Amino acid sequence: MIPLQHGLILAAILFVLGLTGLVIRRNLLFMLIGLEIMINASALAFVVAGSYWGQTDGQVMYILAISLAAAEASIGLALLLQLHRRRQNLNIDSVSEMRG
Amino acid sequence: TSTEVIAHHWAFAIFLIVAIGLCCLMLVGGWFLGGRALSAKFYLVAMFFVIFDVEALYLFAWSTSIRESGWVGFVEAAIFIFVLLAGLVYLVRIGALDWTP
Amino acid sequence: MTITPQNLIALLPLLIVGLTVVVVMLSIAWRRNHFLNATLSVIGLNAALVSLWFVGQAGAMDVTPLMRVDGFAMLYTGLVLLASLATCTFAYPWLEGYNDNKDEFYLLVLIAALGGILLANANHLASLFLGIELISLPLFGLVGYAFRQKRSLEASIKYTILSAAASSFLLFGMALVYAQSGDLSFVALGKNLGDGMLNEPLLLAGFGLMIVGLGFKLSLVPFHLWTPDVYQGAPAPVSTFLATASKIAIFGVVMRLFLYAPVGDSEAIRVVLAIIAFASIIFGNLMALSQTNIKRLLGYSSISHLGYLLVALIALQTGEMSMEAVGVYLAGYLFSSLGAFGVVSLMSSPYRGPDADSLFSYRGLFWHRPILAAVMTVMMLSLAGIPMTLGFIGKFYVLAVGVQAHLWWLVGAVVVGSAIGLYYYLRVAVSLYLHAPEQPSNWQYSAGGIVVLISALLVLVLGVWPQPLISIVRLAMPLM
Amino acid sequence: LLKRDPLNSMMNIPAVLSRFAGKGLLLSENGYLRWYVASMSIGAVVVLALLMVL
Amino acid sequence: MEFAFYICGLIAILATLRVITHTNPVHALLYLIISLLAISGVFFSLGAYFAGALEIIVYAGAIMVLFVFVVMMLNLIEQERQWLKPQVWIGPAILSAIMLVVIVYAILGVNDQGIDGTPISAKAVGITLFGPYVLAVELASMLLLAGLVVAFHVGREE
Numbered sequence: 069m070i071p072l073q074h075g076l077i078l079a080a081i082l083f084v085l086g087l088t089g090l091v092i093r094r095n096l097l098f099m100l101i102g103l104e105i106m107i108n109a110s111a112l113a114f115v116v117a118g119s120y121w122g123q124t125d126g127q128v129m130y131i132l133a134i135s136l137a138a139a140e141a142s143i144g145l146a147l148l149l150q151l152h153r154r155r156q157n158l159n160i161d162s163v164s165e166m167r168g
Numbered sequence: 169t170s171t172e173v174i175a176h177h178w179a180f181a182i183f184l185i186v187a188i189g190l191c192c193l194m195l196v197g198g199w200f201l202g203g204r205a206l207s208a209k210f211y212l213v214a215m216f217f218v219i220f221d222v223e224a225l226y227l228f229a230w231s232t233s234i235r236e237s238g239w240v241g242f243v244e245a246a247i248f249i250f251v252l253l254a255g256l257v258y259l260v261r262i263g264a265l266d267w268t269p
Numbered sequence: 270m271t272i273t274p275q276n277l278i279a280l281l282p283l284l285i286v287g288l289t290v291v292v293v294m295l296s297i298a299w300r301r302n303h304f305l306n307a308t309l310s311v312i313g314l315n316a317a318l319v320s321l322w323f324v325g326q327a328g329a330m331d332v333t334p335l336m337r338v339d340g341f342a343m344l345y346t347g348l349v350l351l352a353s354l355a356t357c358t359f360a361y362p363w364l365e366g367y368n369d370n371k372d373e374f375y376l377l378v379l380i381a382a383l384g385g386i387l388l389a390n391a392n393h394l395a396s397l398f399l400g401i402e403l404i405s406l407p408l409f410g411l412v413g414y415a416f417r418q419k420r421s422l423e424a425s426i427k428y429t430i431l432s433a434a435a436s437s438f439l440l441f442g443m444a445l446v447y448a449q450s451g452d453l454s455f456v457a458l459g460k461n462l463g464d465g466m467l468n469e470p471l472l473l474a475g476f477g478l479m480i481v482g483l484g485f486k487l488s489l490v491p492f493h494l495w496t497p498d499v500y501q502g503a504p505a506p507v508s509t510f511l512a513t514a515s516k517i518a519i520f521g522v523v524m525r526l527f528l529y530a531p532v533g534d535s536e537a538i539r540v541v542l543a544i545i546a547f548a549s550i551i552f553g554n555l556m557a558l559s560q561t562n563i564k565r566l567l568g569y570s571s572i573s574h575l576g577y578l579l580v581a582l583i584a585l586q587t588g589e590m591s592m593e594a595v596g597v598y599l600a601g602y603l604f605s606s607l608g609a610f611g612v613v614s615l616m617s618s619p620y621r622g623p624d625a626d627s628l629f630s631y632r633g634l635f636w637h638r639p640i641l642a643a644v645m646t647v648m649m650l651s652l653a654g655i656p657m658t659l660g661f662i663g664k665f666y667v668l669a670v671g672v673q674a675h676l677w678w679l680v681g682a683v684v685v686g687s688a689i690g691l692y693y694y695l696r697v698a699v700s701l702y703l704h705a706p707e708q709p710s711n712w713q714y715s716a717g718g719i720v721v722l723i724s725a726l727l728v729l730v731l732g733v734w735p736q737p738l739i740s741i742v743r744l745a746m747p748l749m
Numbered sequence: 750l751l752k753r754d755p756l757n758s759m760m761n762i763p764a765v766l767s768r769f770a771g772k773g774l775l776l777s778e779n780g781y782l783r784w785y786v787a788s789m790s791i792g793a794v795v796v797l798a799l800l801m802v803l
Numbered sequence: 804m805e806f807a808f809y810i811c812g813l814i815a816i817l818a819t820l821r822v823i824t825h826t827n828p829v830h831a832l833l834y835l836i837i838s839l840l841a842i843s844g845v846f847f848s849l850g851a852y853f854a855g856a857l858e859i860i861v862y863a864g865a866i867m868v869l870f871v872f873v874v875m876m877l878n879l880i881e882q883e884r885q886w887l888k889p890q891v892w893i894g895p896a897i898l899s900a901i902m903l904v905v906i907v908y909a910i911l912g913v914n915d916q917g918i919d920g921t922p923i924s925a926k927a928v929g930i931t932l933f934g935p936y937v938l939a940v941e942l943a944s945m946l947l948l949a950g951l952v953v954a955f956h957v958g959r960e961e
């Protein structure tokens with residue numbers, strides 16, 4: 069009764085919202101937050117695709133996606149803690165000296 | 169859709185809204201009535217909780233279908249839990265799970 | 270399908286690398302011994318190579334709905350394992366200079382080798398996604414292993430953020446493809462489309478998002494800007510492992526995906542990949558023109574060489590020798606980048622600390638270390654495509670595959686980018702034999718030295734005499 | 750009129766073009782992570798539009 | 804089931820829109836938790852009961868707890884509000900809008916027989932996970948071990 073198209077469009081909306089939140093923010097924490105939004109949107113799209121076909125594979129890919137999201141959130145917050153404890157500044161544009 | 173399942177859906181929804189409304193009304197009556205006049209170990213503990221929670225979800229999914237998975241599934245969960253215990257042992261011996269050094 | 274005992278006899282490198290991970294981790298939990306843990310890592314990788322020989326005694330079979338093992342998979346597994354062994358060998362003097370925990374580097378290197386093996390045997394979208402994450406996140410650890418170093422922390426943050434974004438793009442594309450196809454197997458990606466309806470927009474857009482993620486992973490233009498910063502900031506053995514193992518494993522699974530997907534011979538994806546290959550070759554060669562940093566220059570070089578690989582990939586279904594060309598090119602590129610980033614590793618070893626500069630200064634290298642200057646020159650000529658080297662044999666293979674498929678724009682791009690490459694590679698080599706104005710004693714440094722000399726001897730011998738490697742790659746046919 | 754080899758200069762013109770193009774392309778490697786993410790999204794837009802056109 | 808799906812999707816979209824524009828980190832994380840709860844409600848509308856339970860348990864109950872922990876220990880760019888003035892988000896917003904319109908053009912035009920909403924239980928997901936998905940499970944434990952090792956190596960104090 070629910071269209072697959074509507075669930076896919078909802079996942080796409082959340083994905084592009086996470087992408088623009090990733091781009092527009094100088095603070096690294098909001099960049100990590102936008103990354104979490106994008107990966108949650110991708111997992112939602114996999115759930116919609118799996119539930120449309122009546123298959124278990126969508127929830128399995130969802131489980132793999134949230135395992136990835138947990139590990140990436142852990143690593144990114146470790147890197148953010150390192151940046152804050154070595155520079156006392158979460159500005160990502162200051163971490164830019166390698167260029168050319 | 170049986171009558172019992174929609175009765176239970178209605179009961180669950182009413183349970184939700186009565187609980188939330190009771191708490192909100194409790195705080196509303198509290199405010200409206202009366203007379204006016206860190207170390208990195210926290211991050212590591214939360215991170216360990218997240219990782220072992222995802223492993224716990226895999227074990228959750230195994231546990232509900234033991235009779236439909238056979239001894240092969242037991243072996244699969246055996247290497248899974250062995251790697252989990254190896255990681256836990258690793259964290260214990262390196263001092264990661266040691267609040268007091 | 271389920272698992273048989275013979276399926277376990279078609280799974281040994283994965284199990285060997287995983288058991289090496291567990292054993293090294295428990296040995297770290299016992300004590301913090303750099304020598305013993307590094308040795309356990311290299312014995313585990315060597316045993317995985319011997320396990321590859323043992324499964325070469327066995328046949329080719331589909332071990333899961335996920336995995337498929339054939340000679341294609343064994344060839345790419347061997348390339349990944351050789352890259353990992355070289356990385357550990359270069360990492361030991363570097364980690365000897367590193368005044369912190371050292372064996373976690375080996376644990377992450379082994380875990381990334383496991384992900385490379387998974388990508389080498391992947392026949393399924395779930396396995397491809399898992400292998401990509403399994404080579405990516407240990408590289409998050411390894412690129413910023415020296416997180417107190419400001420350049421390494423910068424490279425770690427850049428690679429972590431950008432690879433998380435690319436993983437999101439790839440996962441979203443996989444979800445859209447599964448929404449269309451209804452099956453995550455490689456062979457079913459377009460099976461439910463017939464009568465010329467192969468160009469369905471949802472399948473194409475899903476493959477486009479996967480192309481964005483994979484082309485980030487392959488340093489393809491315009492997902493390439495991370496490459497010089499991440500290459501320069503990362504530790505030099507980590508740069509070696511990234512440039513060799515990650516790109517080889519991801520391009521192998523991309524080769525398999527475009528081989529068994531029925532949507533692989535759509536004209537739209539072929540045209541988009543042709544544009545990406547053209548831009549990658551030209552942009553990498555042009556951007557490496559005025560580089561005085563060897564690591565950034567090798568990043569741009571990696572962009573151009575993956576453009577050549579993409580040119581070989583486009584001629585898959587039209588031609589026949591495309592996968593053989595990819596194998597020969599991957600062997601030559603593996604040995605060349607191994608030797609190049611190996612010299613970068615040993616001259617930057619031991620690790621001098623987070624505050625000291627890691628500048629290379631290759632000018633005048635002959636007058637204080639002649640043999641490493643000779644090996645750097647040999648690999649510079651190999652990446653240029655000089656006929657006395659196996660890099661030319663790969664260039665000749667991709668040129669033959671572009672001529673056979675009449676990809677004349679890509680052939681002209683190869684020639685022009687080759688000329689620009691000649692300029693900057695020969696500048697690097699003649700700088701090695703220039704005069705420097707002004708400016709070890711172990712056996713693991715000598716092990717890294719003999720590794721880069723062995724790679725030079727292999728690239729020179731297979732440049733003059735390429736037939737053994739050609740016959741090695743040719744027998745590695747997959748289950749068609 | 751022909752003491753400075755004009756044909757040599759006209760054949761050396763592609764080297765000048767290559768140097769100019771490389772110097773122009775190196776400006777996009779400014780080192781900003783936000784621009785790297787922006788360029789990834791721009792390339793995603795270009796790839797998706799090209800695939801939808803064909 | 805359609806009613807709950809549409810309200811939860813709308814709540815998730817609205818909460819994400821408040822997430823990417825807010826200035827306070829704790830408030831943004833609270834809106835992100837709200838969006839995760841809405842996404843779990845969407846999962847329960849589709850019949851993926853295990854996915855909704857996992858969206859509350861693992862995403863809102865573990866990962867966002869980690870983000871919240873990091874923000875509290877930071878005790879935290881905020882003052883100028885760069886992302887609010889149109890001269891900063893003029894480009895990225897229309898870029899994301901173009902990407903979204905191309906993606907939803909690809910979405911519109913596919914076979915859509917509708918979602919039945921029949922519950923795919925966690926038992927069947929477990930049978931699949933511990934049937935034809937052995938290497939996904941073992942290598943996912945492997946991946947989480949890798950992430951744990953990386954995050955301890957980077958995030959410890961010393």
Ligand SMILES: CCCCCCCCCCCCCCCCCC(=O)OC[C@H](COP(=O)(O)OCCN)OC(=O)CCCCCCCCCCCCCCCCC
Nearest residue numbers: 558684685686688689690692760761762763764765767768
């Ligand atoms: C007659 C027409 C039909 C036949 C055509 C045949 C084509 C192949 C044979 C002709 C090739 C001509 C190449 C001309 C440039 C040769 C290289 C050169 O002059 O390099 C010198 C110059 C470096 O000078 P320097 O001042 O030291 O640099 C600044 C830093 N110190 O270097 C530089 O500034 C950078 C050099 C970059 C690499 C060289 C340029 C390559 C361009 C593509 C070449 C392929 C052919 C394209 C079409 C050519 C015209 C038809």
Ligand SMILES: CCCCCCCCCCCCCCCCCC(=O)OC[C@H](COP(=O)(O)OCCN)OC(=O)CCCCCCCCCCCCCCCCC
Nearest residue numbers: 169177804806807810811814837840841843844847848920
């Ligand atoms: C009221 C107007 C809006 C007011 C403001 C927003 C309030 C919250 C709105 C979202 C949550 C409630 C949505 C409405 C649910 C009502 C019940 C319902 O529709 O149940 C249908 C279905 C029953 O299950 P099934 O067996 O599939 O039945 C289908 C036909 N027999 O149900 C299902 O299949 C699943 C039922 C939903 C999933 C469980 C509940 C999720 C709750 C998510 C909360 C998110 C955070 C909210 C934050 C609010 C503040 C911003």
Ligand SMILES: CCCCCCCCCCCCCCCCCCCC
Nearest residue numbers: 239240243247272283284287941942
């Ligand atoms: C009915 C009685 C059955 C007895 C034998 C049961 C076990 C047989 C099959 C064993 C399969 C083991 C699979 C292990 C996979 C490990 C993967 C590790 C990846 C790193």
Ligand SMILES: CCCCCCCCCCCCCCCCCCCC
Nearest residue numbers: 635639642643644646647650657702
């Ligand atoms: C096919 C490979 C061709 C290049 C080989 C490079 C290594 C050869 C062995 C070392 C030779 C060094 C010669 C240095 C000469 C320096 C002369 C300076 C004064 C004019």
Ligand SMILES: CCCCCCCCCCCCCCCCCCCC
Nearest residue numbers: 551676677678679680681682685686
């Ligand atoms: C900036 C560097 C640009 C390099 C461009 C190199 C171009 C080389 C020449 C390509 C010629 C292609 C001709 C194609 C003809 C196809 C005819 C088809 C007939 C059916």
